[PDB]
Design a binder for these strands. Structure first.
Lengths: 147, 86, 134, 105, 122, 52, 50
RNA sequence: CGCGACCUCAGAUCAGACGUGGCGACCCGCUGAAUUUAAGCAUAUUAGUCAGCGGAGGAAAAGAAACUAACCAGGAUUCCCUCAGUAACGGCGAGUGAACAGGGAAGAGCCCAGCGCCGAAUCCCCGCCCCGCGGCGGGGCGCGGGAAAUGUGGCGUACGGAAG
RNA sequence: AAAUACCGGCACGAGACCGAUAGUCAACAAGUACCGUAAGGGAAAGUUGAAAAGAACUUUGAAGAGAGAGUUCAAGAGGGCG
RNA sequence: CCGCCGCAGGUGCAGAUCUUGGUGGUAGUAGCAAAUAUUCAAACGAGAACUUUGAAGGCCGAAGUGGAGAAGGGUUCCAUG
RNA sequence: CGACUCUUAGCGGUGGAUCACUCGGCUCGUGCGUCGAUGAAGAACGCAGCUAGCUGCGAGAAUUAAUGUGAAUUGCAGGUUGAUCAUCGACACUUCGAACGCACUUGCGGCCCCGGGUUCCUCCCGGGGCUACGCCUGUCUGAGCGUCGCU
């Protein structure tokens, strides 16, 4: 069947694609350390003021304070039952229920490329010293730990 | 009289089956396999045919020894010992 | 998440491993839940399914309280055939209907010298995990 | 063909350069394997310094640099001699030794 | 009849040969019934008898070589069947004696100047 | 060989052979016509070996 | 021709044996993919090599 | 003529070992173009590159100065950063084009011949015994055989060495 | 020795990649069928249904084929059939 | 599977005697014309200008359209459906 | 009038696009880094009860022993003191191929030991083991108007 068809040239069935994609494309981008800290001090500063946080869609109309600076024995915890009960008492739970309710299926080829499900992003727990807080909090869908 | 008339006289085989490669490229007058070079000690290959090499390389046959080698490697070529009896 | 770098979460890989599993791994894949009476008795969640177990169907068209004895375990198909779960063909004769062992619950075990050692080993390793927890 | 006022360029890309492009996707795995081998050694030579032996003080040559000081290769034999260490004991108790170094000063 | 190997590994050298011959006879009788085209119960016994031949043969061979390679053990030169076949290059390497050899220069060096265990204070 | 056939049939059927004539078939398998010496009848032997 | 070698006759034997159609009990297996023998070779159409 | 010694050669299905061929992404040694660029073209460029030939290893090659420097001097090899599109080559056209210094990754050093002293103090192999070795090794035993003064081993090498 | 190189080989893990005229020539009995005296050249070709439950039986015809029944959520899914 | 805010590209076809596959008109058209020649009955059959049997009329005309081989082919040989 | 043709719409074809799927690729990274005269890679020929291809395997031939495992295999037959799977360290591994008695017909030799003809005693038959090149250490047998030695 192939005899006298048309082999190379982008237009042809078979044939290599136009400008075949290389692995020395510039994938990475480097940023100045001053700008990287300018951006982080503005990402922290916007977290404080509750008009910006509510406009992100975080459901925090029951949090007593916006900074929600919790006790230091949060870090000593060791069970997800302690971690959920803490979020219930601080009334941040209705953000986790919003993440549960967001848990849906992705649209397109992402599903066959090991990104089947999508969901929402939840409360961002910043700690000092890791004494089981990560082990306690990681099984709650939505929480990102940070140092 | 160079075409259809002159194809009537094609009744003498030049190439028979080679005894290394089994391919019908053993020239009878020359007595040399025009594929693998049979009377030559070394296998005939060239880098100008990357396709012809991958047709006849180490991963195209049975490999009845070289597959038990790969299996037997993973326990450091043990021999003589058996598993503990029942 | 899974944190082991030597276990895969790739869709295609897990699908291939499931469909190209050898018989002794298809055995384990084709485990069924034990009924609540048997769980409180033996302290075991599940068991691999066997030829002459008595079993209830839970899901699909043939569900109910009917305790049927298993009569074929088709590992190539990942299906099991039960006593009185059947279907009439055009030419009058009946055929058995393949149920996946997950949509099924063991109400009676086929107990041996070997299956009893699986039960005991499972129930034993259960409490050793339990006392590490509490 | 030149357009207007602009720098007159000579790109070194007349050879088969695409065959010999060396890409650095190794880098974070190369750093991890180095840090691995480093800690492995540091644990192996267990109470001995992690850096290894002591290097001597050495002036950089060439007027551009001779206001600086580096770590040298190893201690000269006439520095070991007047310090009173044997050249074959020095290396065994963790002192770098260079048999090539002269002492002008 | 299911003829195992555990029982065959405790019988005499003349018994196992007789058992192989009457099995070969038994197969030679079944293979006539296959060509006459009769009794499907006797087309199923062709595998059973062939594997029962393979079992009693591999028992003979294994008892013969375990006997030879024991008799040839306390001897420098043994046949190439009974010499160890690891890979070819792995047979060409030096012994655990020829590795552990070190010249009298080294043996005196590492007598005088061995490597010390030390620690620097900071 | 014909010699090995003529020894084999003699050993396997307690028989005597006039001559053996072999041809290799287009199947790639030999077929050996083993004629018996007149002390033995082919039809007498066919029954006891089990071909009829 | 009538005059043959041993190698050629073994070779032509293997090509005769290979040129049978598929069994009908293979079309009922659980991996039913093979419909018919796609490697049928007729004497007049395709000329076998040699 | 004859008979042993020695040297220079043959022949053996003699005893016991070893080499060949494959793969070839990476590595080492040779051989080695023309497309192309110079808006033509011959030197140049493509390029010590493709094709060809040989040889390997888990890496290979290199490596402990017949070095760099001209400093208040550095101190085996290899790799990265920079030196640097630089000094330099070039129908001085098109083009080509390193090194030292500096910061790190790693870091490791050694051995013969020769000169000389120790009675060849050295090595290989057969035969018997015992432990006991799926890397054929240790011990005893032999006026058992050979290698070797046309030089084996111990000491010892440019950072000095040896004897008293 | 170490630090360095690795589109071959054995084994793994991943991706802002492709989704059957794409991605390997090859998702299938692919270096297969087929072509060439030979060196060499070299394809096409994925999907019934949850489950074969793959249409007993009556009837027209020499038969392919129909007409009624029947299974199924569905044959407006009938074997190369989403 | 999609909207909004950012992000990234192998991102938009009428044409390239473009590539691959598919279908038209022409068209029920050109055609099925080299080497003398066919015919009557019967059989089998659901079905006969063409099969088979008989009878007739003919051709090849021993350098044959006859009987056997070599090379080449590789089961095309033979029986039954 | 109708036929014929044109346009549009419904249904039926022909054809297999679109959409959705994916045990396949492509790319990047990691650990390892192992062939062969003790017969490799590659070829050829065979092997299942019904078997063409694919796959697996070698006259013990879609597999034996062993170990782990614990009731299947399954298109149709047939018949727990371990069915079937995976593992694989014991045994096995036809003919070509570096390819090894000589040639590539599988054709013709030779040398020794067994067994049939016979109860080693010759031709014929069958079975077995040896019979390639280059080279290293030793051994045996020699060669030389090469250099000497002694009667």
């Amino acid at each position: 069947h192939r005899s006298g068809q048309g082999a190379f040239g982008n237009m042809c069935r078979g044939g290599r694609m136009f400008a075949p994609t290389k692995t020395w494309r510039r994938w990475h981008r480097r940023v100045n350390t001053t700008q990287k800290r300018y951006a982080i001090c503005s990402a922290l500063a916007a977290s404080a003021l509750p008009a910006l946080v509510m406009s992100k869609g975080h459901r925090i109309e029951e949090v007593p304070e916006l900074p929600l600076v919790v006790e230091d024995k949060v870090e000593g915890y060791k069970k997800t039952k302690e971690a959920v009960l803490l979020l219930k008492k601080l009334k941040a739970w209705n953000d986790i229920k919003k993440v549960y309710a967001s848990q849906r299926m992705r649209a397109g080829k992402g599903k066959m490329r090991n990104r089947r499900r999508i969901q929402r992003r939840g409360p961002c727990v910043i700690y000092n010293e890791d004494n089981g807080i990560v082990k306690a909090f990681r099984n709650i869908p939505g929480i990102t730990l940070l140092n | 009289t160079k075409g259809t008339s002159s194809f009537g006289k094609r009744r003498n085989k030049t190439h028979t089956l080679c005894r290394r490669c089994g391919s019908k490229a053993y020239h009878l007058q020359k007595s040399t396999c025009g594929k693998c070079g049979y009377p030559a000690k070394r296998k005939r290959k060239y880098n100008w045919s990357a396709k012809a090499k991958r047709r006849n390389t180490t991963g195209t046959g049975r490999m009845r020894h070289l597959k038990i080698v790969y299996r037997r490697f993973r326990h450091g070529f043990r021999e003589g010992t058996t598993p503990k009896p029942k | 998440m899974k944190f082991n770098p030597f276990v895969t979460s790739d869709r295609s890989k897990n699908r291939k491993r499931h469909f190209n599993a050898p018989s002794h791994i298809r055995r384990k894949i084709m485990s069924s839940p034990l009924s609540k009476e048997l769980r409180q008795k033996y302290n075991v969640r599940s068991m691999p399914i066997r030829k002459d177990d008595e079993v209830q169907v839970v899901r699909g068209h043939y569900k109910g309280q009917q305790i049927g004895k298993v009569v074929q375990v088709y590992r190539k198909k990942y299906v099991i055939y039960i006593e009185r779960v059947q279907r009439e063909k055009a030419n009058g004769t009946t055929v058995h209907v393949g149920i996946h062992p997950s949509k099924v619950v063991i109400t009676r075990l086929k107990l041996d010298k070997d299956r009893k050692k699986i039960l005991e080993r499972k129930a034993k390793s259960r409490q050793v995990g339990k006392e590490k927890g509490k | 063909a030149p357009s207007r006022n602009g720098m007159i360029l000579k790109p070194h890309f007349h050879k088969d350069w695409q065959r010999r492009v060396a890409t650095w996707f190794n880098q974070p795995a190369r750093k991890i394997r180095r840090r691995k081998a480093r800690q492995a050694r540091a644990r192996r030579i267990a109470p001995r310094p992690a850096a290894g032996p002591i290097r001597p003080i050495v002036r950089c040559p060439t007027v551009r640099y001779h206001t600086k000081v580096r770590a040298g290769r190893g201690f000269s034999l006439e520095e070991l001699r007047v310090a009173g260490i044997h050249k074959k004991v020095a290396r065994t108790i963790g002192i770098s030794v260079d048999p090539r170094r002269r002492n002008k000063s | 009849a299911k003829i195992k190997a555990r029982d065959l590994r405790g019988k005499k050298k003349e018994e196992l040969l007789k058992q192989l011959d009457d099995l070969k006879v038994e197969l030679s009788q079944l293979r006539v019934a296959k060509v006459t085209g009769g009794a499907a119960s006797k087309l199923s016994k062709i595998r059973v008898v062939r594997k029962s031949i393979a079992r009693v043969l591999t028992v003979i061979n294994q008892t013969q070589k375990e006997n030879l390679r024991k008799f040839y053990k306390g001897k420098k030169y043994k046949p190439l069947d009974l010499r160890p076949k690891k890979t070819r290059a792995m047979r060409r390497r030096l012994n655990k004696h020829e590795e552990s050899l070190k010249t009298k220069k080294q043996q005196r060096k590492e007598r005088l100047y061995p490597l010390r265990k030390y620690a620097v204070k900071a | 060989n014909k010699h090995q056939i003529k020894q084999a049939v003699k050993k396997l059927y307690d028989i005597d052979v006039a001559k053996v004539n072999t041809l290799i078939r287009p199947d790639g398998e030999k077929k050996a016509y083993v004629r018996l010496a007149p002390d033995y009848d082919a039809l007498d032997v066919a029954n006891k070996i089990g071909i009829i | 021709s009538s005059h043959k070698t041993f190698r050629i006759k073994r070779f032509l034997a293997k090509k005769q044996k290979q040129n049978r159609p598929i069994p009908q009990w293979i079309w009922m297996k659980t991996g039913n993919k093979i419909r018919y023998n796609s490697k049928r070779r007729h004497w007049r159409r395709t000329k076998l090599g040699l």
